[PDB]
């Protein structure tokens, strides 16, 4: 796209022992107007792959359509092989690069989570074709406001539990609500483990303390 | 700027040009050829941007030679001028247009001498004398003052010398040498060079 | 402007069973004269002429393509073209290049091949035909010859008075234009004659 | 516009054309481009007509005041200096000028060229305007210091005539002056059209 | 332009104004911005008139062919998806914000938004156009779940009147359309029947 | 230019002025702006006159073909659809504005067509540069279900108001009356201006 | 913000042996609309001097007021009324005083001289002026000049003896010239004023043209 | 002002026998938003002078303050002379020109009405310093939409009565409401006669007929 | 920013939010946009913070001197006129939209608007700021003549909540101020006491 | 471009310059003076924009003469160079800055010869030889190749002639004549001109 119209904000991501948890808020902003207020910016690709995207929302929907058809078609003949978090991460990097090279990019900052083979996966794919891996992620203003807390915690302890990771995620979502002007107070939280992907409905950070 | 001139007489079409090939504040060459002979009686002079001149002039020459080889006789000066105008105009609105300023001199077995002018927009005229370059402004009024319709070749070279001397005195460029040749009944004839050492 | 780069001025006037067309001779570049015998009027038919003004390269190109098409037409049909038919064909030719157009404004003047009824018309650069009944102009001194023709024109004129009026108009029109002059040529298309003349003008 | 001037044995000769144009429309056809500053000086007009006229009127006033104060006439060098100094106060504000001062003093014939930029140079033959390059080709080829008055007249007329024949912003009539020891005189005001038939057939 | 649509149990209600401007001049004051896509599906148009007309025509033709060959009434979801496909393919050349509303025997009345950009979403009520920004707080403070047909008509008329009295690019008359399983209902609320709200005095 | 049409009880009445300009100068004093499209359909034009001419000629040719192929009278809706589809295909670069009108088996219709391709059916409309002047008169005096003479009076008064208050209009008033039976063309209908003697 | 506007209007002066004539049209314009249909441009200065103006109307008004004030200052200081040449010279200096933000006017002074004959002076916006025999400024000047060249200058025609301009022939020429100008320029044509400066005094007349 | 902020629209004006009537609507637009809806754009200068202005509203208020102080101060010593419509028209022209010449103009299009000495006055003063008189006026979009009807009527009859002039004014205000997108449906109507100035409160053009 | 003020018989009510942004970052979230000009006069600030602070200070100083030398309480009209003078003199360098409200023994409670431009006007209620455009229809459909103090407080709180829930540049807490002949009343409506309006579900 | 050169020897400071005064494609003069003597032993050479050169140079000269008249002795070359730099730098950030490129040659009763370079930013150097203009690029390497610290005046004029000849061959400008003079113990001495007729 040349100019994004309806955009989302920061997506978070943490990997703990035996799973990956990500989160994002439910809001579509039309350039400083909170136009749509109940949209879902998190996808479930297959039984071990989740995806959350920032930026343009029509681009996110197009990529949802394409990726879903791919997973369907490979699952059709059911020969015993299935796509993986890494295969989907690579496919996405290649498609983003091919779009930037024609000067017609897709305007998202996707995040891939996964859990296959007994160990977790967490990857980052920018619109220009930059891609890497890390034990934590954050896009948009989150890259300035939430990554310091995640790094402060993972410095001391390199491994967390499911409960601690979830607590950390919500503790960061609160500060994003305090300091980001495109943020909203309703968010979803997905989680992938050995049993599959689970998404949780509209949560709130009502743990606010406005002592003015 | 490069310099070009032509003077048509009763049965001759005396022309001239310079020999400098500057690139920048420096001078790269000192004896450069701005005349392209294309037939036993047809001359073509060119100025303008590098690459364009030679690329454009060699194309015209090869097509004229091919016409002769096919048909057993040569093109006339009028046909060559019109062929040149066409080919130059068809490139004007295309993707790569040339920036050449031309002068076609010739002589034919019926109509006699002929001198054609052609700017870079591909507008074709016919004149008893013409000139291209910045020095045209300075030498167009000497020709106006001293030209005659029945002038002889002895006086024509005189008049050309007077023009070149005026350039030597009043131009801010350094153009020391000039080629000179005549096209009469007997084809092209190279003549003595004019130097201002 | 591009159509003021070589100068030029064309004019046509209508009489009683006669037409007249005129032009100037100067050919030059921005501020410098080159020659004084440039041709701007072309004989498309026995009693059918066309005059072109504007960029000289496009004058020449359009004249040549038009002669192409008219030769083919008169060979295929078997007779000569009419003034009205020629105008439509020229408009079609000019409109084929609506984007990236020729910079030339034509003028047509002829006689009906069977009723001997006059015809004058002018077209704009893109091919818009406007037919009049008194006179048309085109060039860089359009306003000057407008002012002259509106005052001097009369209806049902003889060829003599028509020649006098068109000449007296062109002279005083181009005497006030910097990039036009060097003489004027006048064609008079009568029924059985086509008289050509050259006027004595100023050379500054 | 075309103006010229050349010193020779018998003083200075000055010539000009008379057409003025605004774009491609010829507004006027007989202007006076020689500016009679006083009985013993004269300037010339090229560039902006308003600037030319205004500043040479200022110069005429200052020359008169100099004479009244010092009981003696100013000289060509001093007048040119006064004009150049006056216009140097407005450099870069859009003035358009370029002139020639001619006269006679205790040092003989004088011929100076002042510009809007701020230069001034002594010479023996100058030429200004947009037909200057056409007039140079005839002045350079005909000029000789060992020439008398009517040969100078003919050379000047011919230069201006060919310049207006080849240039589009020049035409009309040609006005010829002549600076001698005892002030200047007016020689002729022939018109280029009546010159052209004389200079051919 | 101020278009609007709200959903009740059995069908939806549509609404729009009638003014087409050009800068500060009113070129048409009786415009009809509600167009029928099929027998039971409509769409509200906002943005560029030529764009919205062309897209409505293309979608009408495609949907008619699709339904005639599948041999059954079509779906509001199908119509919305065809609109979204075109608006996303030409997203850089077109200027169209659409609202699609209709009735199908499988889900009844639905309302879909397709803003400029080519994104799709289902909503309970939707506002769009140039004057819709002046009534966001009003539709936030007035909507209540499970309304009936007459309450929906009143709600839409009042919101549109409030938008027209403040937006300089909106005005004229109100055109309403309640679509149900029986058919289509069209009325005009002109002149003195526009619901007047009290203006502060003194 | 000023063009204006109206829908009366049993048909249409169109009108226009007859002055073409070029910049600030009057070129033609009898420029015709009401074109033939079909024996029952006409059209008016404003804007780039070359574009108006080209578009109306192409549409008239297409409608003649369609009528020959079916064997029945053509329709204002068909003409409107053809026009708007072309104008949208060219993205507004063909600068024509039209007041198409006719009478078919369904009754009198009257449309407006704009350079980008948007249309609008109405009971009366104006276009050009004196369009606001004609629209004021129409708003002030239009009545539905009018009669022929009063429709003609109203449209002539609107055109005259546009002529006398707009610098780019003047010199004559044309009228074209279309009903279910007749087709009346009045080229010199009114002559409000006469040159000084 | 552009401080100038173009308001149309044509002026025309003609000098004779005993007389002098300034004429003008009465339309005021801006863009494509008409402000008024009765607005003159000829202003009587003294008993033997008229001035016509064209261009920008605000500058025209300011300029005429300034000139009227300076005539009175001169008379109070020198015990006599000004002359046409002194008026033309002073106007030159006044126009040059505003040379970097100038009056956008085209002036045409007319009057009688001390020796009893016509004196037309043409001006340009910044001061340059010259004594002519006729002149035309405005929006149709390029249309009017060649006709006056052919009629009063007697140019381009031989086989004629060129006797002087009587008042009758001069007035007829002015009328016909303006009629033909009105038939082709879109900025002239409401009515025509004609001031006649003569020994006895200034007279005026009016003739109607054709409306829009 | 460099950029106007809150602007008004068209003002009308007609002069009848023994008086002048003007009118204007009550609305302040903030660039296509009808922000303020009950402001008065008509002033009463003294017992025989009215004034209505278009364009910037802060400039209109400043000029109201200045003109009011002038009238007060001249009325103080009460010597038997009072300002006139013409004196106020001239003063306003001069002040507007002095502001445009410093490249800092006042952004209004005022209209002056008056009735003194037994005959009416109606004048126009633009922001650039253009000023004239006419038997009718209209500013803004009114110059295109309402002037044709006024001229159509005054062509036939050169003189109207008070009732006919008022009818005409309201008949034009209706069409302005129909076709202008910055217009409102509430307007005032002032009138000056031999007894003084009378202003009438919020009127309506409820004579609308929307047959769609 | 969303500021507001409404008038009742005896005094006026003021209100504002508390968020100060910089692009898309919240620099201060407990800002106080109501400032006292005198003992009984206040002003609401919107636009540029440095401009509005400087102008409030200069006006405070001028008005204090004026009143101390005239030996009586000042007028809301005087305060509004000093504000208008400064805002019109520096109209091209400053960016300030003010609302002045107060109480004087001669007319009680008044409310004056001074938008950017330097124009003055008296109003019954006034809204200003970046988020005020979302509640125009709401204040048009909710206001009714002759309200009381508690009804005014409720009206202002509900309007400000509706503005904050849609404008991206507004939020935080609500600060109210009812001014009367007795004195000034300041309260904060934070957290869970913000009046929630129903959001559409499904 | 104009040309300047200077060569300092054991007890002489030989300098040179050209004589052309072009305005446009034309040449206005042929014997122009680019040297300003300011004292019995101090020379000043200038190039750059018209007006600036003479206006700037005459100011310096009048101030130097006034210093001498007041104090009974003349300025030294060092003092004159520093005074010049100061006055030139104080105008750099003012409303009207000059665009002159300078060269100050001199000779004093204690320190001997002196040659100062100064560009238009008012940075002052001291060199055994220098040059201004476009020809400096071509003549700076001949001086590098053939200069000697103990060169005599007979050979110095030889070297200057070689430089000017290289310019004649390789420049694209026409500069036919050059002034040449020497400043030794006995003040300034004009020398023979060098022409390439």
From Swiss-Prot, chains B, J:
Matches recorded under CDD domains: proteasome_beta_type_2
N-acetylmethionine PTM sites in chain numbering: 1
GO biological process, one term: proteasome-mediated ubiquitin-dependent protein catabolic process
Disulphide bridges: none
Record carries keyword DNA-binding: no
PANTHER family (alphabetical): METALLOPROTEASE TLDD, PROTEASOME SUBUNIT BETA TYPE-1
Protein name in the entry: Proteasome subunit beta type-2
Organism listed in the record: Rattus norvegicus (Rat)
Gene for this chain: Psmb2
Curated annotation (Swiss-Prot), chain C:
Top-level taxonomic group: Eukaryota
SUPFAM superfamilies xref list: N-terminal nucleophile aminohydrolases (Ntn hydrolases)
Residues that bear N6-acetyllysine: 76
Record localization: Cytoplasm; Nucleus
GO biological process, one term: proteasome-mediated ubiquitin-dependent protein catabolic process
Residues bearing PTM N-acetylserine: 1
InterPro entries assigned to the protein according to its UniProt record, in alphabetical order: Ntn_hydrolases_N (IPR029055), Proteasome_beta_3 (IPR033811), Proteasome_bsu_CS (IPR016050), Proteasome_sua/b (IPR001353), Proteasome_suB-type (IPR023333)
Cellular component annotations (GO), alphabetically ordered: cytoplasm; cytosol; nucleus; proteasome complex; proteasome core complex; proteasome core complex, beta-subunit complex
Pfam families documented for this protein: Proteasome
Keywords, alphabetical: Acetylation, Cytoplasm, Nucleus, Proteasome
Family as reported in the entry's similarity comment: Belongs to the peptidase T1B family.
Its job: Non-catalytic component of the 20S core proteasome complex involved in the proteolytic degradation of most intracellular proteins. This complex plays numerous essential roles within the cell by associating with different regulatory particles. Associated with two 19S regulatory particles, forms the 26S proteasome and thus participates in the ATP-dependent degradation of ubiquitinated proteins.
Protein name: Proteasome subunit beta type-3
Organism: Rattus norvegicus (Rat)
UniProtKB/Swiss-Prot annotation, chains E, I:
GO cellular component, one term: cytoplasm
Active site per UniProt: 1
Cell compartment(s), UniProt: Cytoplasm; Nucleus
Principal EC category: hydrolase
A biological-process GO annotation: proteasome-mediated ubiquitin-dependent protein catabolic process
Keywords assigned: Acetylation, Cytoplasm, Hydrolase, Nucleus, Phosphoprotein, Protease, Proteasome, Threonine protease, Zymogen
GO molecular function: endopeptidase activity; threonine-type endopeptidase activity
Listed EC numbers: 3.4.25.1
Catalytic reaction annotation: Cleavage of peptide bonds with very broad specificity
Superkingdom of origin: Eukaryota
Modified residues (Phosphothreonine): 35
Family to which the UniProt record says this protein belongs: Belongs to the peptidase T1B family.
Purpose of the protein: Component of the 20S core proteasome complex involved in the proteolytic degradation of most intracellular proteins. This complex plays numerous essential roles within the cell by associating with different regulatory particles. Associated with two 19S regulatory particles, forms the 26S proteasome and thus participates in the ATP-dependent degradation of ubiquitinated proteins.
Subunit structure as annotated in this protein's UniProt entry: The 26S proteasome consists of a 20S proteasome core and two 19S regulatory subunits. The 20S proteasome core is a barrel-shaped complex made of 28 subunits that are arranged in four stacked rings. The two outer rings are each formed by seven alpha subunits, and the two inner rings are formed by seven beta subunits. The proteolytic activity is exerted by three beta-subunits PSMB5, PSMB6 and PSMB7.
Protein name (Swiss-Prot/TrEMBL): Proteasome subunit beta type-6
Section covered of the full-length record: 34 to 235 of 238
From Swiss-Prot, chain G:
Subcellular location: Cytoplasm; Nucleus
Gene Ontology, cellular component aspect: cytoplasm; nucleus; proteasome complex; proteasome core complex; proteasome core complex, beta-subunit complex
CDD domains noted in UniProt: proteasome_beta_type_1 (cd03757)
InterPro entries recorded: Ntn_hydrolases_N, Proteasome_bsu_CS, Proteasome_sua/b, Proteasome_suB-type
Domain of life: Eukaryota
Keywords associated with the record: Acetylation, Cytoplasm, Glycoprotein, Nucleus, Phosphoprotein, Proteasome
Gene induction: Up-regulated in prefrontal cortex (PFC) after nicotine exposure. Down-regulated by theophylline (THP) and 1,3-dinitrobenzene (DNB), two reprotoxic agents thought to induce infertility.
Phosphoserine sites (modified residues): 33, 39, 133
Keyword Glycoprotein carried by entry: yes
N6-acetyllysine: residues carrying this PTM: 175
Pfam families named among the record's database cross-references: Proteasome
PROSITE patterns xrefs: PROTEASOME_BETA_1, PROTEASOME_BETA_2
Residues bearing attached sugar chains per UniProt: 29, 180
Tissues showing expression: Ubiquitous.
Keyword Phosphoprotein (UniProt): yes
Family: Belongs to the peptidase T1B family.
Assembly mode: The 26S proteasome consists of a 20S proteasome core and two 19S regulatory subunits. The 20S proteasome core is a barrel-shaped complex made of 28 subunits that are arranged in four stacked rings. The two outer rings are each formed by seven alpha subunits, and the two inner rings are formed by seven beta subunits. The proteolytic activity is exerted by three beta-subunits PSMB5, PSMB6 and PSMB7. Interacts with SERPINB2. Interacts with RFPL4A.
Protein name according to UniProt: Proteasome subunit beta type-1
Organism: Rattus norvegicus (Rat)
Organism taxonomic ancestry: Eukaryota, Metazoa, Chordata, Craniata, Vertebrata
Gene: Psmb1
């Amino acid at each position: 796209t040349q100019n994004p119209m309806v955009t989302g904000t920061s997506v978070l991501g943490v990997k703990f022992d035996c799973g990956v948890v990500i989160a994002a808020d439910m809001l579509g902003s039309y350039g400083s107007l909170a136009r749509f207020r109940n949209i879902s910016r998190i996808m479930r690709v297959n039984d071990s792959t989740m995806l959350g995207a920032s930026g343009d929302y029509a681009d996110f929907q197009y990529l949802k359509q394409v990726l879903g058809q791919m997973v369907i078609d490979e699952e059709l003949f059911g020969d015993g092989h299935s796509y993986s978090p890494r295969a989907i991460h690579s496919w996405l990097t290649r498609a983003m690069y091919s779009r930037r090279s024609k000067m017609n990019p897709l305007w998202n900052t996707k995040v891939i989570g996964g859990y296959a083979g007994g160990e977790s996966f967490l990857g980052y794919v920018d619109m220009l074709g930059v891609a890497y891996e890390a034990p934590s992620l954050a896009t948009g203003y989150g890259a300035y406001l939430a990554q310091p807390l995640l790094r402060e915690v993972l410095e001391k302890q390199p491994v967390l539990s499911q409960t601690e990771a979830r607590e950390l995620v919500e503790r960061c979502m609160r500060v994003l609500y305090y300091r980001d002007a495109r943020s909203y107070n309703r968010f979803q939280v997905a989680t992938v483990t050995e049993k599959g992907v689970e998404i949780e409905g509209p949560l709130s950070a009502q743990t606010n303390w406005d002592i003015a | 700027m490069e310099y070009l001139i032509g003077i048509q007489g009763p049965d001759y079409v005396l022309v001239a040009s310079d020999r400098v090939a500057a690139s920048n504040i420096v001078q790269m060459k000192d004896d450069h050829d701005k005349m392209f002979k294309m037939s036993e009686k047809i001359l073509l002079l060119c100025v303008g941007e590098a690459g364009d001149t030679v690329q454009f002039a060699e194309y015209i020459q090869k097509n004229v030679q091919l016409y002769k080889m096919r048909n057993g006789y040569e093109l006339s000066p009028t046909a060559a001028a019109n062929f040149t105008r066409r080919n130059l105009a068809d490139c004007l609105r295309s993707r790569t247009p040339y920036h050449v300023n031309l002068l076609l001199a010739g002589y034919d077995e019926h109509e006699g001498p002929a001198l054609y002018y052609m700017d870079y927009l591909a507008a074709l005229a016919k004149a008893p004398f013409a000139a291209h370059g910045y020095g045209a402004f300075l030498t167009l009024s000497i020709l106006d003052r001293y030209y005659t319709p029945t002038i002889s070749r002895e006086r024509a070279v005189e008049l050309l010398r007077k023009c070149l001397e005026e350039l030597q005195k009043r131009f801010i460029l350094n153009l020391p040498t000039f080629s000179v040749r005549v096209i009469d009944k007997d084809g092209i004839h190279n003549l003595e060079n004019i130097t201002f050492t | 402007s591009v159509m003021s780069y070589n100068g030029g001025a064309v004019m046509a006037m209508k009489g009683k069973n006669c037409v007249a067309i005129a032009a100037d001779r100067r050919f030059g570049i921005q501020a410098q004269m080159v020659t004084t015998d440039f041709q701007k009027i072309f004989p498309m038919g026995d009693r059918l002429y066309i005059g072109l003004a504007g960029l000289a390269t496009d004058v020449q190109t359009v004249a040549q393509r038009l002669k192409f098409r008219l030769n083919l037409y008169e060979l295929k049909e078997g007779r000569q073209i009419k003034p009205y038919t020629l105008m439509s064909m020229v408009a079609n030719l000019l409109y084929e290049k609506r984007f990236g157009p020729y910079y030339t404004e034509p003028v047509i003047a002829g006689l009906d091949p069977k009723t001997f009824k006059p015809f004058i018309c002018s077209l704009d650069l893109i091919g818009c035909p406007m037919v009049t009944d008194d006179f048309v102009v085109s060039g860089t001194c359009s306003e000057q010859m407008y002012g002259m023709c509106e005052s001097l024109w009369e209806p049902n004129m003889d060829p003599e008075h028509l020649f006098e009026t068109i000449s007296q108009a062109m002279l005083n029109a181009v005497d006030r234009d910097a990039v036009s002059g060097m003489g004027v040529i006048v064609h008079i298309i009568e029924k059985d004659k086509i008289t050509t003349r050259t006027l004595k003008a100023r050379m500054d | 516009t075309t103006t010229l001037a050349f010193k020779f044995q018998h003083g200075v000769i000055v010539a000009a054309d008379s057409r003025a144009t605004a774009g491609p429309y010829i507004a006027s056809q007989t202007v006076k481009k020689v500016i009679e500053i006083n009985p013993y000086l004269l300037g010339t007009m090229a560039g902006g007509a308003a600037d030319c006229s205004f500043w040479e009127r200022l110069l005429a006033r200052q020359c008169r005041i100099y004479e009244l104060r010092n009981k003696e006439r100013i000289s060509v060098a001093a007048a040119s200096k006064l004009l150049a100094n006056m216009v140097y106060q407005y450099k870069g504000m859009g003035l358009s000028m370029g002139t020639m001062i001619c006269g006679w003093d205790k040092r003989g014939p004088g011929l100076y060229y002042v510009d809007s930029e701020g230069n001034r140079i002594s010479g023996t033959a100058f030429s200004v305007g947009s037909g200057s390059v056409y007039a140079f080709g005839v002045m350079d080829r005909g000029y000789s210091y060992d020439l008398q008055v009517e040969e100078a007249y003919d050379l000047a007329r011919r230069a201006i005539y060919q310049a207006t024949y080849r240039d589009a912003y020049s035409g009309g009539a040609v006005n010829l002056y002549h600076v001698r020891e005892d002030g200047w005189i007016r020689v002729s005001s022939d018109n280029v059209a009546d010159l052209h038939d004389k200079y051919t057939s | 332009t101020t278009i609007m649509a709200v959903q009740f149990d059995g069908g939806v209600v549509l609404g729009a104004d009638s003014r087409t401007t050009t800068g500060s001049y009113i070129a048409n004051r009786v415009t009809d911005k509600l167009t029928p896509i099929h027998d039971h599906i409509f769409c509200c148009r906002s943005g560029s008139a030529a764009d919205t007309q062309a897209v409505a025509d293309a979608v009408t033709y495609q949907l008619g062919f699709h339904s005639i060959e599948l041999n059954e009434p079509p779906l509001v979801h199908t119509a919305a998806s065809l609109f979204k496909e075109m608006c996303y393919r030409y997203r850089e050349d077109l200027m169209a914000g659409i609202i699609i509303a209709g009735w199908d025997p499988q889900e009844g009345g639905q309302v879909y938004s397709v803003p400029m950009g080519g994104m799709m979403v289902r909503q309970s009520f939707a506002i769009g156009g140039s004057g819709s920004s002046y009534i966001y707080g009003y539709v936030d403070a007035t909507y209540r779940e499970g309304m009936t047909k007459d309450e929906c008509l009143q709600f839409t008329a009042n919101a549109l009147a409030l938008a027209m009295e403040r937006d300089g690019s909106s005005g004229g008359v109100i055109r309403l359309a309640a679509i149900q399983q029986s058919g289509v209902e069209r009325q005009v609320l002109l002149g003195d029947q526009i619901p007047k709200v009290t203006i502060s005095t003194l | 230019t000023t063009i204006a049409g109206v829908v009366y009880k049993d048909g249409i009445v169109l009108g226009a002025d007859t002055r073409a300009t070029e910049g600030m100068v009057v070129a033609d004093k009898n420029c015709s702006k009401i074109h033939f499209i079909s024996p029952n359909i006409y059209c008016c034009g404003a804007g780039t006159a070359a574009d108006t001419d080209m578009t109306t000629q192409l549409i008239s040719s297409n409608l003649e073909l369609h009528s020959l192929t079916t064997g029945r009278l053509p329709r204002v809706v068909t003409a409107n659809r053809m026009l708007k589809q072309m104008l949208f295909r060219y993205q507004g670069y063909i600068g024509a504005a039209l007041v198409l009108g006719g009478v078919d088996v369904t009754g009198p219709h009257l449309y407006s067509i704009y350079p980008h391709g948007s249309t609008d059916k109405l009971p009366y409309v104006t276009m050009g540069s004196g369009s606001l002047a004609a629209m004021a008169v129409f708003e002030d005096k239009f009545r539905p279900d009018m009669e022929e003479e009063e429709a003609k009076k109203l449209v002539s008064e609107a055109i005259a108001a546009g002529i006398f208050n707009d610098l780019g209009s003047g010199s004559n008033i044309d009228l074209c009356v279309i009903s279910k039976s007749k087709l009346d063309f009045l080229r010199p209908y009114s002559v409000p201006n006469k040159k000084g003697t | 913000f552009s401080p100038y506007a173009f308001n149309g209007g044509t002026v025309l002066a003609i000098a004779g042996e005993d007389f002098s004539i300034v004429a003008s049209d009465t339309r005021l314009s801006e863009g494509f609309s008409i402000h008024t249909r009765d607005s003159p441009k000829c202003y009587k200065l003294t008993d033997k001097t008229v001035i016509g103006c064209s261009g920008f109307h605000g500058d025209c008004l300011t300029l005429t007021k300034i000139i009227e004030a300076r005539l009175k200052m001169y008379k109070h200081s020198n015990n006599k009324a000004m002359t046409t040449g002194a008026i033309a010279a002073m106007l030159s200096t006044i126009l040059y005083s505003r040379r970097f933000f100038p009056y956008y006017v085209y002036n045409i002074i007319e009057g009688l001289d001390e020796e009893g004959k016509g004196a037309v002076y043409s001006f340009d916006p910044v001061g340059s002026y010259q004594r002519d025999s006729f002149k035309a400024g405005g929006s149709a000047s390029a249309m009017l000049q060649p006709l006056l060249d052919n009629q009063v200058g007697f140019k381009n025609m031989q086989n004629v003896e060129h006797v002087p301009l009587t008042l009758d022939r001069a007035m007829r020429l002015v009328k016909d010239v303006f009629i033909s100008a009105a038939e082709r320029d879109v900025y002239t044509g409401d009515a025509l004023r004609i001031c006649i400066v003569t020994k006895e005094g200034i007279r005026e007349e009016t003739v109607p043209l054709r409306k829009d």
